[PDB]
Design a binder for this molecule. Sequence first.
Ligand code: HEM
Ligand code: HEM
Ligand code: HEM
Lengths: 29, 29, 160, 160, 32, 32, 166, 166, 32, 32, 215, 215, 288, 288, 37, 37
Amino acid sequence: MEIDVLGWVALLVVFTWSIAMVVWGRNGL
Amino acid sequence: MEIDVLGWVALLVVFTWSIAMVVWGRNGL
Amino acid sequence: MATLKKPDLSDPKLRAKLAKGMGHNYYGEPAWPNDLLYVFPVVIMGTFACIVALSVLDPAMVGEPADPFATPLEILPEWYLYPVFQILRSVPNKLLGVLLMASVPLGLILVPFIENVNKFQNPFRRPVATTIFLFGTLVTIWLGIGATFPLDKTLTLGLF
Amino acid sequence: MATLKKPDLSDPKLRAKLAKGMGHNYYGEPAWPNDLLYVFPVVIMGTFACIVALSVLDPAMVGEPADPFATPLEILPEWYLYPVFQILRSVPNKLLGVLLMASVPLGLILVPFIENVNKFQNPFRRPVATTIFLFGTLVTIWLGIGATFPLDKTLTLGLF
Amino acid sequence: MILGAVFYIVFIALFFGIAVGIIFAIKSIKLI
Amino acid sequence: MILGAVFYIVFIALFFGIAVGIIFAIKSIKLI
Amino acid sequence: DVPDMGRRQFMNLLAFGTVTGVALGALYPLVKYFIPPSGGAVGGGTTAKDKLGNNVKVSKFLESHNAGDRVLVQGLKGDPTYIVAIRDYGINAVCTHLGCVVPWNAAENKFKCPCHGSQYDETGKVIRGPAPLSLALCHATVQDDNIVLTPWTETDFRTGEKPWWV
Amino acid sequence: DVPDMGRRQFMNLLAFGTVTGVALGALYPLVKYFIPPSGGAVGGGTTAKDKLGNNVKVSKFLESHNAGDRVLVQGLKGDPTYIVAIRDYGINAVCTHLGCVVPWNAAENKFKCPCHGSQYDETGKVIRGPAPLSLALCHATVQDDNIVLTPWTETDFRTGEKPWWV
Amino acid sequence: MTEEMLYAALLSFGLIFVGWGLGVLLLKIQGA
Amino acid sequence: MTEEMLYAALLSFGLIFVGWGLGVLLLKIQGA
Amino acid sequence: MANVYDWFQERLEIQALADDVTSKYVPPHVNIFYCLGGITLTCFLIQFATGFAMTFYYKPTVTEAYASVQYIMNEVSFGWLIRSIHRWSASMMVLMMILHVFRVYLTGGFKKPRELTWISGVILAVITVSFGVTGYSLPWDQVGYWAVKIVSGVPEAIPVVGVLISDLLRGGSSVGQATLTRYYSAHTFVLPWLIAVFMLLHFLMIRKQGISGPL
Amino acid sequence: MANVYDWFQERLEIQALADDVTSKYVPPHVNIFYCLGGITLTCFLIQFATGFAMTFYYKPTVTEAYASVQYIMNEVSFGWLIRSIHRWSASMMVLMMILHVFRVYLTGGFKKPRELTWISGVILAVITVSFGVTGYSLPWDQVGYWAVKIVSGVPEAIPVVGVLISDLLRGGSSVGQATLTRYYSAHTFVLPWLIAVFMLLHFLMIRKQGISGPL
Amino acid sequence: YPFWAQQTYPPTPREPTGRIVCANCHLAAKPAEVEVPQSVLPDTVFKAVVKIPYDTKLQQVAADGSKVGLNVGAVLMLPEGFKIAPEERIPEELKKEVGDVYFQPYKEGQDNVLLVGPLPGEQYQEIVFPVLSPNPTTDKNIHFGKYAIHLGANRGRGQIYPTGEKSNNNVFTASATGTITKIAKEEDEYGNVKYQVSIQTDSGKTVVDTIPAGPELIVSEGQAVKAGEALTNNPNVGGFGQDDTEIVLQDPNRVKWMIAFICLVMLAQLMLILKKKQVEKVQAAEMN
Amino acid sequence: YPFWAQQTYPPTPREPTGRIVCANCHLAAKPAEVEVPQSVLPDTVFKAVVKIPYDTKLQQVAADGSKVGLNVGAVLMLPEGFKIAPEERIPEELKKEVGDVYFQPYKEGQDNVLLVGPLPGEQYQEIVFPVLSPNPTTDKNIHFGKYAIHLGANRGRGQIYPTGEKSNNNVFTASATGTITKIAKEEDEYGNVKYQVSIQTDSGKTVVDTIPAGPELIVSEGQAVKAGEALTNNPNVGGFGQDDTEIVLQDPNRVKWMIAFICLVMLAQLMLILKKKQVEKVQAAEMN
Amino acid sequence: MVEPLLDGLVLGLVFATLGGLFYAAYQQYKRPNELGG
Amino acid sequence: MVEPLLDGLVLGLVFATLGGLFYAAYQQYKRPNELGG
Ligand code: HEM
Ligand code: HEM
Ligand code: HEM
């Protein structure tokens, strides 16, 4: 019942890492 | 029973006039 | 460093473009490998990845078989149709409803003809726009929410 | 008179095109009004008009409801599928059938790689092609017709 | 057949007529 | 919440880790 | 010895003129095609239907189908219409506000469109809600087996003047 | 102090490498999606069906459905299979040439695929035509109400060796 | 039912030349 | 059922900055 | 009024576009047969219009396909005309194509500078023939159902992936609803996209290299 | 092997095409928000793939639509994933669009040189919203059927042609089979064509004038 | 006999496959043809011609044995709405070519499905149906359009009686495998000649085969031919055949508009060319 | 009483509209809530919480008249497959918060549709369902996915008995139009107080209205109030309410892969950026 | 199901076309060139 | 039928966006220009 939590977290992580990865990549905003 | 004949003829005429009209138009083959 | 190539203000061709408001892709970082090939895929996979996660964590339902004889209670269009639905139900005059709705896209079409009065991009240098914008964005979310309340408690949103 | 503008063989640009086999739209009659705007519509309306006449004089039928349990007698694909259907039924080996069929488009794909040996357009100046063509066109109509006969009377076409 | 043939000829001729007719009328009035 | 928060931090940190890790390993081996 | 802009425009008129003709001609049937074939091209009112839109047998209805006979039927133009010995008229169940079927309240006698809290009488006519106009009416006679619903001309025997639907 | 073509190819390998991974991953389910869900994932043979592909009641068949019991049924994989006290096996009615249902000739005992004049026996096995292989076979037992058709393993009790269909 | 075929074959073929020639004739009579 | 909304609202908003900053930090640590 | 031209000219350079057109020329080796392409295209546009039209009444289901067709023929205004044109125009599209292929070949127009245009054309022909075959079965009448029931088995001869292929096209072991669904998706969604991409290529190349040379 | 490049280079001028690409540049005023367009596009491509996918199992008929959906959800492999992505991606396409519109407006990017790009964008938005609304009703469940049963009456207020319009969209006086047929034709054939033409315009103009200027 | 189709297959002469039940008893196959006009106007008498050719100077076996000629008969399946023209709406010219034919409907109601025969082949090599096309204008449920027409035609005695027993216009196999002993040829003071054959040898056996008077004999004496073997010869020179065709129940207005539109199109084409010419002359001034 | 829904509407408590039949007799409307987790794994006990709040320090009218408090009750509609957890699969912690509740199935079979009540409101302001999620792995006809859940909850006496007669926890109009004469208040040595009102005047009339003991009186004496007019006051402080929600019967593997893929994606994103950096350094050498 | 009218249009047009094509291949295999090839 | 998670993502993203946009409108309404406008 906490593999469920890892699940939603995966959502939050990609959404976050993705922004992070864009910003980093284009030195950006 | 001969408005039927005029009908098919209409087919033959456009097919003919069309070629005729192209050839004439582009002085052509 | 990044990667930078300043405008060649020595090129008449570039200058004529700038003049008609329009040579801005001739300078900057080079669009090819730097963006197109390396950050675009990042944005694409990211976009896809979020959508997939959402789809697993919160998959689509199957509701109940349409019934011509039984009107749901609990029947709302999708969120982006809230304001319009609001407008549409809370306006006793049907035609006026239609026109107000139609005015949403007809309106946005005039926007560039109205605001062509100047040539300011930056919203700070155009306080009237920025205000009518913000005002509208507000009213918009306002009726959006209103759509989720009962007809009466609607405009007020139950506050006054 | 017509309307003519001869190749400007003084233009290196035209010449380089001709060299790679390819500047032929720079000379001739002017494509715009003369053709595009006046004979193209003629060809279009003509094409449409014949089709409409055919459709009135000889409209589409509605056949009988599909029956899983009852195989028609009198079951042929459309004409352009005759040859292939021929080939397909009159060849005891299924795989060989498939490949022979697949060979029709794979074949036509090689055609420009095979006949690239020279650069003759005019079929007179390429008697081998023109012959293998004509031969094929013949064989084609040949099996096309064959498809409309019974299996046995098929190849012969009932003659030998 | 015979009846088609007649109509055919009359139909085409009729239009051929208008064609030629129109050239000259159109020509001999400085439109061509 | 609390349990999410932990996983979240550990998850990001974990990857942040690999990111930084990879720069230098990748840097201090003349690939960058 | 060259035609001026005047006579070129003339030719154009003739040419593009007639070409437009040809296009309008082609366009005409396509347009009519998309306009759906019309309900009952003979009369103005057809037979009633049930759930599956079949045919409502008269004696199976009377014999057994809810007490205080007020059931929903698939009537004129497919609008679900209440049927209430029977009653002369049917009552169109689409509220005049946005078009939700209005349930019948046997306990209060009024209709309530739950969509926005508007209500009607035993007759169709409205007494509240944002619905600005009474439920529709229509003739409910009997032809042999089933029911026959015809459009309601006469004046609203509830309102006083012409109907909003005529 | 600049990476050579060697180490750039390395990075590429890593980058486009893993991006391919991601694409293959996304592609995988889409591919499986288009492959249709499979008939009976439990056993190998289901019940038989009639015209509407319903369920063939045993006593309504015997009682009345053509003499010299040789009727067409919707069997394995949806292939129409003849049913002939009944008979052990069904006879697949798709001729082995191009796949037309082969009618049964009660008057000559043979099957004739009219598509190209090939024919079979009372058993399925072929005696002519361009059909290069016998009609298919399958078990026709009885479970409670209807019929139960299972795929035919054993050897062709008509041919001598393994079946072409196993 | 197959007299339709040859009828169509001949005319479809034949009428081309009638059209063609008819075209040429127009050309002569106009002055090309 | 509406604690889902604010939860999503806050995080969708909030996580942007976490991503943003996380991005910047990467920039500092690399040397931009 | 206020010259619409200048408005557009300022932004998009409407003129460069007009000039590309009015600077092309048609060489004297170009006869009436150099219409087969356009004429084939024109038959396709007629298919597109009428096919779209029919998607407003036709119902791709084994229980209603045949009656939908009957309805379009008997009850829809000019329905008979729309379906009939769709039939004839299908037949003429294929024929005109074949004539076009004859002209291309007996004109050597598929040579060096242009083997890509010819290859794309061959694909057009395979796509075009796939329309015909999928469409043929939408009436779900006797002729069409049986034609599908045959072609659909052909693939099974192929060695490793012949049954999978068959299964993919028919949505299972036999012909049935799945088949009509898939053929419908094919005929009204897949093929019109594929044919538009490859026509787009065919035309673009053609525009890039101009017509072939004189013979 | 044998340089594929040169082959293509000889005929089509593959190089002029590469050069147009590697000569564009992204100005420093261009931040992450200048992704909303692409991201909206990306959500559309996801709609296209998954929507196509579903046209292989979904059956646009009042007797089978709901069960088809149920089948796609329960029995088709990854069907649940394909439908779910189609739902979310629909929702995100619309949202990302709206964000994109915010960026365009708070950036004055719709001004003089570019009012055509903005107008075409508004049409995109109307097309995009029409997808949502037509698609919403394909499950032919209670929610969707009732939503259709309402919007579809709205047009009737319009004076001379309000009832005709209504009738055209619903295929008659009331909601019914005709309606589902038309909404299906709309959602899977009309709108994907319209949206592709207007995206084609939006992109072409964008490519012709480059991004707007810095603020 | 067409009326036996009627008794054995009450509801229709055509099976779901298109076969036509006459093929069940008449097992030979000779060619058969139907000709109708490509199109007819509503409510118009027209001629549907069935062709059933065979070698006229040819004879077949009779039931007792003689050698009379044969009769022809057909079932013609017209589309819904169509039917045999009222005696009075049939012009003299055509009445005369139709002869004394009894167009007989497959069952009450089905007036578009017509049985005819037996009629003597010497005269009815082709049979002429006076048919009257239906009227969409007065029968709301008949629509303009193309419709199929089906024909099954036969000449000559058939092979199986409705009772289910063999006739005599076919061949007779051999009862079982073995050798032939004696061949006698009775002749019941009523039941005509009936050559009788006997088998035997090997695994016992003593069965006999009785063959009616008419077919040939191509067997000798003392030969061991297996069971089910051609020991009769095939007497039958008859046969049954099918043809299909279509006819367009055509609406005058559909044609009349089609014509008008074709005329608009040609007119419009002319105008474009005339125009082109104007431009050509104009361009000529730009040459110099 | 939930069990009256059962008697009056045997086959289900929810109408095609989603209404829920409890609204038929319990005519007030107070708010009602259901909370389940967003997701559950197959075959797992979980907690579904019904909320039915009302002003605890508040009293309602009793049947004879007194002024006792009220009870609560609900019908909870779980998705197919779901059901109340086995006594033994319920952890102590939760057993304790569930109390002495009698989860009672709408009808034999329908174990996912649960009736509960009457339970005293002072303690059961929220009611806790111990529910056990189904298992797609062992029940071939339960599928992973999102499902609806429906709740109808009520507190307080209702307004109409199953017999169909009015109760006393509502208002009493006026019998007919006219004027008020006398108001008496009987009290049958069994049937408690029942104030009786009288009308009259104008067009004859002499009807009477008998009103049970409990509701107020907001009428005086000598006033002409038309028929059907609020002459009682509204005693009712109860009410019934609905809420809906969804729960995802979720499959671990679906999540586990989704995670793996998200990780591949982030990994891949990193690689692209790292790459971009390499190019940036390479490009730097081309600056000079 | 066969279709005489079409089948006929097919051949008429096929031959008439194969024909005029060769006719054109020929007309130019003789009085060719001019303009400069 | 409403949908809390979406409705929330909508607002979070709307505001966070309206926000960063103005933030960007601003960051440049101050240290602007350079390069040559
Ligand atoms: C068997 C039951 C049967 C049918 C269905 C049928 C239908 C049609 N016939 Fe015939 N027919 C026989 C059988 C059947 N026919 C048999 C046996 C004979 C020979 C009887 C005899 O003369 O002793 C027979 C005869 C005819 C004839 C007469 C031929 C002659 O010249 O002797 C005709 C014209 C004939 C035609 C048809 C048609 C047409 C049928 C279509 C339904 N049969
Ligand atoms: C009418 C037939 C009826 C139904 C269908 C129903 C269903 C549910 N109830 Fe109730 N109920 C009444 C009617 C109906 N209920 C009436 C009348 C009463 C008052 C009876 C009395 O006490 O004399 C009544 C009572 C209740 C109660 C007790 C309230 C109290 O504190 O007195 C509860 C908890 C209750 C709930 C429900 C629920 C839940 C129904 C859902 C099917 N009703
Ligand atoms: C080359 C292009 C096309 C060809 C060759 C073609 C061919 C066909 C054919 C042969 C049929 C069978 C007609 C019949 O019933 O006899 C058909 C049916 C149909 N087609 Fe097309 N078609 C083409 C394009 C399209 C397009 C683009 C659409 C959708 C916009 C379409 C929609 C339909 C529909 C809905 C039917 C069923 C109605 C009917 O069966 O008559 N077609 N098509």
